[PDB]
Amino acid sequence: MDTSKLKPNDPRVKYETKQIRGKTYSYILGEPAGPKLETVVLVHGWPDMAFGWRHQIPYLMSLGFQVVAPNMLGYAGTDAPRDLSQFTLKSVSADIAELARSFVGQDGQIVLGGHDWGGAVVWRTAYYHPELVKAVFSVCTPLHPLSAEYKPLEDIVAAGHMLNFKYQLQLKGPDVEARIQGKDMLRRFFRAMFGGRGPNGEAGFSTSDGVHFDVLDKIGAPPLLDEQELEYYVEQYALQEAPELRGPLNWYRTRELNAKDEMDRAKNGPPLRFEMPALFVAASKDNALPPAMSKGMDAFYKDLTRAEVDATHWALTQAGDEVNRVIGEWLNKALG
């Protein structure tokens, strides 16, 4: 089997939709090489899509896993509901639970992996559906505790806290949604998001201010995508109805809804506890989610394996072969 990364419209995989908890969910499906060991569900983040797992999908197939990688709510061929409650980590976990079981049966179990927002999702999914999740890993995103209260992020960063998250203020607002419409702007956006720079090294995106709209005109080719990959992100994001970024930016509009779900769990729900084998792959140059952010996380796991790869936030691609080996070796030991 060819184990190189997926190309746009790779024929080694299938592209399908299913109705999931009221929404059309599009996904990549890769069938295993050899008798199926497990089904693996892979969850991307922002501003990515299923194709962001392009290094992991053929690899996991070659290891004997069936691989389901959805375009998550708001992204590409998956529906983008208007109701923000559809975008909470709890509802999205329920989405993943139903999609998972639509392949493994209701009595089935999966391996579950996540990155960025997807990492946050899979920890919550492993918390809300421990019957389903046999093993869970996250790249870049560490566990965060059950929210015990709600504070607006404005007031949080105004006090000087969570400064590495202040970009999310712009994202939840109207500026990115209103400005990044159509393929021309989306192309610039993606050059910015995947590391392209301007004639004086101007960054198109920063964790402080978000998208630097004034830079997008001079933004050069991104180092972390090739030209056809870039076009593929543009084409697929274009599947959303204008404003195309509404769905993806909805992930930054649920702080209070998520806080309300989880304050309920902090009060009455079971403890945030993970009994199944778990893997956290840190990224050294991820300035949105620096490795130090995971300090103290191990106390919530019976069985947490830690790794760390030298890469930016985009570790699935930049360090794809290393990430692959880390997942493969951990899975080989987790499941035995």
Ligand SMILES: O=C(NCCCc1ccccc1)N[C@H]1CC[C@@H](OCc2c(F)cccc2F)CC1
């Ligand atoms: O939005 C995200 N990434 C956007 C792209 C970042 C980037 C950097 C450089 C170049 C391109 C892109 N990530 C989400 C991941 C899940 C969320 O986790 C919730 C959460 C907490 F509330 C508190 C503590 C930890 C914790 F995970 C937090 C932001």
